């Protein structure tokens, strides 16, 4: 894989989300790591493998997990995914990013 | 944007490793909204892309 | 004279709770209602004088 | 007016012998009576010195005894040796107490005889138990005996106190009388010879046991103090660390209803949100084995009050644990041995199994941190940064104290510690070498110094040379600049004076967040703050070596790089016994000017860096982080509602995400609590720790006896304050006892009330607690008048050391360094000032306070002094007094309470006027005068000197000023501005305000920019003259929160103060001569 | 989490007031106002900034 430090060098200096200060938003970065990757190649294969129903768990906020999510429903089906979290990650997709 | 052909690598991988696995499969492997769910947190997903 | 660039949007988590204390006040106001006037016909209706 | 009786009473009751005769002196301000008074004192003199009864002149001069003012009291005594057994053989018929040697791990931290410690007296050692402190077991038995016997007759709620404290005093003075009474020397210290027989650990035991037992007021009081007094007769290293560990569970049991935020540094904003306590099972299964090793130890009534509590977890019978929580910091020091206490840290587990991923990380964060801090300064090419060499040079006042060195000063031997005198030193042999770093290794390796606090562990202190403090002194002051306005640095976010006393978590606190809270002040031998930690920074420094064009900026980086290249190696000196062992200690702690903002550093990142693996289990939002020192919490908030087990899951994950760097944690996360070493909070309301020893020190200061009892006050109000009470008559003994001098072997001198409790530089306490005294009469304004002309004496060791070659030598190095060809015109000014710096050298202050000591004694004992019209504080507030009127007012209640320790009456303020919202200059630092010195600088100059160099003309501030570093250029400009008559009024605004204790103890607790009070100030405006209309404001104030304070009530106020006496007053302004002792703050916050 | 048809749940009665408490029980309404009054300030934000 990629050294993490490297990505989280650039994701932080270009997102430059610590001058987005609200005052108190610590606007750091979240869970880039290793062990995180691998665990959800694995989540994503099994789930499907299984046919087992998964959901998804977000923050708007980070809008970078939904530019992420957007991958995720292009590549993986969508009757994978209940349809309450599907529609809630397309929409914040949409109020934010798209429209 | 800028993560072009490492995406394209890896959708192919995932799909590659989902056929080759769903080989080994017998029972019919039949689609339903189960009860409870498996999480999956977006972090996760923006660690691997 | 104290105010700028802060927006505050009450968490859907606090409406919630405001919404549910809200909903048992008024479940009890009601069942508390019913009971007494069950009560007070009842004894009308049995010539309890 | 009621001190002196009880002064009497102590003398009549401690001598009691017809050869123990008492003898007052006065003093009046008017000529005559004053001639009267003269008589009186001669005529009791000589009766003295005849053996003739002084009773019978007191009637005769009636009028001396009821209007002059009282000064002191004399008494002719003889030895009469042993006295204290004669009184004590009669408290003391219960049984003695058996130690039990079973009880510590250790065998010389039992409570066994000293003989069968140290036979031979060449390695016998005090240190282990020293009190440090100048006052005796002899004079704490006498003044808890003499209470005991001044409330022997009372039969109330004061009976039921006194049966108690005589059962606790019969507990000590039974197992005291078994063997007798440790005599000290002059010095206050124990000798073998007197502890040669008798255990090791009485006389500690004994001060902390009078301390408390004169510190009860209820049952549960008793209970606490009869279940730690017997066990700490024996346990002396597993008590306080045992009953102050499940407090920190406590506060996560709490439901908020209502709760107090912050915004910047003082402000609050209350809220009426209620919070649930959703705290998982296996902490309440931690509590209960913490009780059950409480009970395993020999406690039984204080687990009952800890189990019974829990049944409800309610706030208002809380306070018990609050006042739990500082009775075990009243039990004393656990005062080991430098090796074992080392050794608490000196315990490594370095593993090759640890992540990469996480110390890269951390390592860049870090580097990251340090660049964003230096950038702008190394890049606009920042005056401090050059000349960082010479700016060191100039605060090494405001450094550690090195290692001892044998100096000469032309005729004589010196083992300072000071560094500025090391580099006198250095200067002159040639050995003056900033650019070369000494190494630390085995060639040379640290000494150690040790930080103590009861209930914890030893933290260790590195000793460093003097070129360590120079190199990093001026980055680190910049690095302190950017964490000013930093939100997440805790020690420093403020307004350039405050700091987030109050704490900053109650923000977003509800029932979808959660706070993870922890202490980090064990991790200082760990794995992280080795090579990666100071690799981050060199890492850094390179980054900004390559980010700047100029030269001495360049070296100054090299110089603090080779400093992290050097502390990455380190040895440390540790004795036992006789040899010397040195340890490979790659590693941080203090004692240095680096540790405080870079620990802060390194635990931001990594909790960035930990708090980046909960998401992949976990979906929140990181509201806040926060980081001081020895501990740190983050909060942080869900997409939806909290659950016992996210609370279990997600400490569990963090405990091992934290053993994946190897780096040990009790993991703490809650939903309304936290503890931490300086504060704590339940249920929305913040507490302290009243943890203030006061018969028994840390270590062994320099101040005199005079001043520890100023010091000993001070710690008493603040314990008050914080909750944890004695009684105040005790206190007022021991001042007695402590400011009584001998003149000879039985004549010996007691001052009065209105010596002691009078602005000046003697100042030591209040005749009414939490109320500063002012003076409306002619005697208060006569004896500060005279004592100001006492204060200013001379030190012969500073004239003699400024007057060698080695201190001329430096500041003509200083000078060249800075400016030359005023050899004779600024270059005076500069050694004038250096001498300000020897004063922070003990002797130096020991001779000047105690010359002042002696030249106050020598008017105690002849007539008085009218002082020459040198104007004061008194003098002011003696005229603006006759232009008041009183009236009785009634304010409502409409302030809420949030910190319920406190006295009632001071709540009572608290919950009638708001409490404090902003902060003024207790420094004058934001003034612009201020600006420049902070800019070139760090040093002080007290209030007095700025308001005195306002007073001069145009010419002599810019010696002044030039003198402490500043160039010509910017003074000029500063005069040329006339910027100092826009800043008169804030020097004077501080001045003032420092004077009068304002943000001093619980004035500082107080809104005095509030709309309810202000209200009863009915002050009319004239204009113009602002000083006047200050003062007036702020006079009235303190009258009507001082009659709050001692009466309940509220008054109004009203000064149509005539345009005749604004203007006479005006003038009077800017020519005080008065001044304060800093030894008489008390800060509630230490 | 998908919930089944084999799953129940209960509706509160929130029936309006049926006792008219604002037409003449000035006493009871003031406590009832008073009691909404200090919950609705327990859920309005502070201003955090």
């Given amino acids: 894989l990629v050294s993490t430090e490297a990505q989280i060098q650039k994701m932080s200096q270009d997102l430059q989300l610590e001058a987005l200060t609200i005052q108190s938003e610590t606007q750091f970065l979240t869970g880039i790591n290793s062990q995180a990757a691998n665990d959800c190649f694995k989540t994503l294969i099994a789930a499907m493998l299984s046919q087992r129903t998964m959901s998804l768990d977000f923050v708007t906020t980070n809008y970078m997990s939904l530019i992420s999510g957007m991958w995720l429903l292009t590549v993986v089906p969508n009757d994978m995914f209940i349809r309450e979290s599907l529609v809630a990650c397309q929409l914040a997709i949409i109020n934010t990013i798209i429209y | 944007s800028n993560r072009l052909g490492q995406l394209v690598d890896l959708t192919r991988l995932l799909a590659y490793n989902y056929e080759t696995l769903m080989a080994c499969i017998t029972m019919n492997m039949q689609h339903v909204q189960t009860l409870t769910t498996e999480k999956l947190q977006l972090t996760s997903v923006t660690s691997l892309c | 004279m104290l105010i700028g660039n802060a927006t505050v949007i009450p968490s859907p988590q606090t409406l919630f709770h405001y919404y549910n204390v809200n909903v048992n006040f008024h479940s009890n106001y009601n069942e508390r209602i019913n009971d007494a006037v069950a009560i007070i016909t009842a004894a009308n209706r049995l010539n309890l004088y | ?1086 | 989490r998908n919930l089944p048809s084999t799953a129940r749940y209960i509706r509160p009665n929130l029936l309006q007031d049926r006792l008219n408490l604002h037409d003449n029980f000035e006493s009871l309404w003031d406590t009832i106002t008073t009691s909404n009054y200090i919950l609705a300030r327990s859920v309005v934000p502070d201003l955090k900034e």
Wanted: charge should be neutral; hydrophobic fraction near 40%; aromatic fraction near 10%.
């Fill in chain 4, 1 to 1086: 007016g009621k001190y002196n009786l009880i002064l009497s009473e102590y003398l009549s009751f401690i001598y009691n012998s017809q050869s123990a005769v008492q003898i007052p002196i006065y003093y009046s301000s008017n000529s005559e009576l004053e001639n009267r008074c003269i008589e009186f004192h001669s005529k009791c003199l000589e009766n003295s010195k005849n053996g003739l009864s002084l009773k019978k002149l007191f009637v005769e001069y009636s009028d001396v005894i009821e209007n002059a003012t009282l000064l002191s009291i004399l008494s002719y005594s003889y030895d009469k040796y042993n006295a204290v057994e004669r009184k004590l053989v009669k408290y003391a018929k219960g049984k003695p107490l058996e130690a039990d040697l079973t009880v510590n791990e250790l065998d010389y931290e039992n409570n066994k005889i000293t003989s069968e410690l140290f036979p031979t007296a060449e390695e016998y050692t005090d240190l282990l138990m020293d009190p440090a402190i100048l006052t005796s077991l002899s004079s704490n038995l006498n003044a808890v005996m003499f209470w005991l016997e001044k409330h022997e007759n009372d039969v109330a709620e004061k009976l039921k106190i006194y049966k108690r404290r005589l059962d606790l005093f019969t507990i000590v003075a039974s197992t005291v009388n078994k063997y007798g009474v440790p005599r000290h020397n002059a010095k206050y210290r124990y000798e073998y010879e007197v502890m040669k027989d008798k255990p090791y650990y009485l006389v500690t035991w004994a001060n902390s046991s009078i301390e408390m037992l004169m510190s009860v007021f209820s049952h549960e009081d008793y209970l606490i103090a009869r279940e730690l007094i017997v066990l700490s007769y024996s346990n002396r290293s597993t008590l306080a660390k045992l009953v102050s560990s499940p407090m920190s569970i406590l506060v996560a049991l709490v439901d908020i209803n209502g709760t107090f935020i912050t915004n910047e540094e003082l402000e609050l904003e209350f809220s009426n949100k209620y919070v649930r306590a959703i705290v998982p099972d296996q902490t309440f299964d931690e509590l209960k084995q913490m009780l059950d090793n409480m009970r395993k130890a020999g406690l039984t009534d204080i687990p009952k009050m800890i189990q019974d509590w829990l049944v409800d977890c309610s706030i208002e019978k809380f306070p018990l644990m609050a006042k739990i929580y500082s009775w075990s910091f009243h039990v004393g020091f656990r005062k080991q041995k430098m090796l074992d206490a080392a050794l608490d840290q000196l315990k490594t587990e370095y593993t090759e199994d640890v992540d990469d991923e996480m110390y890269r990380e951390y390592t860049m964060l870090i580097r990251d941190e340090v660049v964003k801090m230096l950038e702008e300064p190394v890049k606009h090419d920042d005056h401090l940064l050059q000349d960082s060499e010479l700016a060191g040079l100039l605060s090494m006042s405001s450094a550690s104290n090195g290692e001892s060195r044998q100096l000469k000063f032309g005729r004589k031997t010196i083992f300072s510690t000071k560094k500025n005198m090391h580099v006198m030193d250095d200067m002159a042999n040639g050995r003056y070498t900033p650019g070369i770093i000494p190494p630390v290794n085995v060639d040379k390796p640290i000494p150690l110094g040790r930080r103590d606090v009861p209930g914890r562990r030893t933290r260790i202190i590195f000793i460093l040379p003097y070129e360590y403090f120079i190199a990093q002194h001026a980055v680190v002051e910049k690095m302190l600049i950017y964490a000013k306005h930093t939100r997440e640095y805790a020690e420093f976010y403020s307004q350039s004076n405050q700091l987030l006393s109050y704490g900053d978590v109650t923000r977003f606190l509800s029932n979808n967040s959660m706070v993870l809270y922890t202490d980090v002040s064990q991790w200082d031998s760990s794995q992280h703050n080795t090579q990666p930690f100071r690799k981050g920074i060199i890492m850094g420094l390179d980054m900004l070596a390559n980010m700047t064009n100029d030269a001495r900026v360049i070296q100054t980086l090299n110089l603090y790089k080779q400093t992290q290249i050097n502390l990455m190696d380190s040895y440390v000196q540790i004795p036992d016994g006789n040899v010397i062992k040195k340890i490979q200690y790659g590693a941080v702690a203090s004692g240095e000017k680096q540790t405080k903002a870079a620990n802060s550093i390194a635990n931001l990142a990594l909790i960035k860096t930990v708090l980046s693996r909960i998401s992949n289990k976990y979906s929140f939002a990181t509201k806040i982080i926060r980081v001081d020192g020895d501990d740190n919490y983050a909060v942080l908030q869900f997409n939806t509602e909290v659950t016992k087990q996210m609370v279990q899951d997600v400490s569990n994950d963090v405990r091992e995400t934290y053993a994946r760097m190897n780096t040990k944690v009790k993991a703490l996360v809650s939903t309304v609590g936290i503890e931490i070493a300086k504060r704590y909070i339940a249920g929305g309301k913040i507490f302290f720790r009243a943890g203030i020893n006061l018969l028994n020190n840390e270590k062994k200061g320099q101040s005199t006896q005079w001043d520890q009892a100023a010091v000993l006050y001070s710690n008493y109000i603040v314990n008050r304050l914080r909750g944890f009470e004695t009684d105040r008559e005790f206190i007022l003994t021991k001042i007695m006892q402590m400011t009584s001098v001998a003149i000879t072997g039985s004549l010996r001198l007691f001052p009065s009330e209105r010596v002691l409790t009078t602005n000046s530089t003697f100042k030591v306490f209040d005749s009414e607690d939490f109320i500063i005294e002012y003076g409306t009469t002619d005697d208060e304004v006569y004896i500060q008048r005279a004592f100001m002309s006492l204060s200013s004496q001379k030190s012969g060791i500073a004239d003699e050391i400024a007057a060698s070659s080695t201190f001329k030598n430096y500041v003509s190095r200083l000078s060249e360094q800075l400016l030359f060809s005023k050899n004779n015109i600024v270059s005076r000014g500069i050694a004038l000032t250096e001498k300000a710096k020897l004063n922070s050298y003990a002797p130096i202050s020991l001779e000047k306070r105690r010359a002042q000591i002696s030249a106050l004694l020598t008017m105690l004992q002849k007539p008085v002094t009218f002082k020459s019209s040198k104007i004061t504080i008194n003098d002011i507030l003696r005229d603006i007094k006759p232009f008041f009127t009183v009236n009785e007012a009634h304010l409502p209640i409409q302030y809420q309470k949030f910190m319920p320790t406190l006295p009632d009456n001071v709540q009572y303020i608290i919950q009638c006027i708001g409490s404090r919202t902003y902060q003024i200059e207790d420094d004058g630092s934001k003034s612009a005068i201020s600006r420049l010195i902070s800019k070139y600088s760090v040093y002080k100059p007290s209030i007095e000197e700025l308001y005195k160099v306002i007073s001069l003309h145009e010419n002599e501030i810019q010696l002044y000023l030039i003198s402490l570093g500043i160039p010509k250029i910017d003074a000029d400009t500063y005069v040329g501005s006339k910027i100092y008559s826009q800043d008169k009024y804030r020097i004077l605004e501080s001045y003032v305000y420092n004077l009068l204790s304002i943000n001093y103890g619980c004035y500082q607790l107080f809104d005095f920019n509030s709309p309810d009070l202000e209200k009863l100030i009915r002050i009319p405006f004239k204009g113009k003259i602002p000083a006047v209309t200050f003062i007036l404001h702020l006079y009235a104030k303190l009258e009507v929160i001082n009659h709050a304070i001692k009466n309940g009530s509220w008054i109004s106020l009203f000064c149509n103060y005539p345009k005749s006496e604004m203007i006479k007053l005006w003038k009077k302004m800017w020519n005080i001569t008065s001044l304060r002792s800093p030894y008489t703050n008390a800060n509630f916050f230490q």
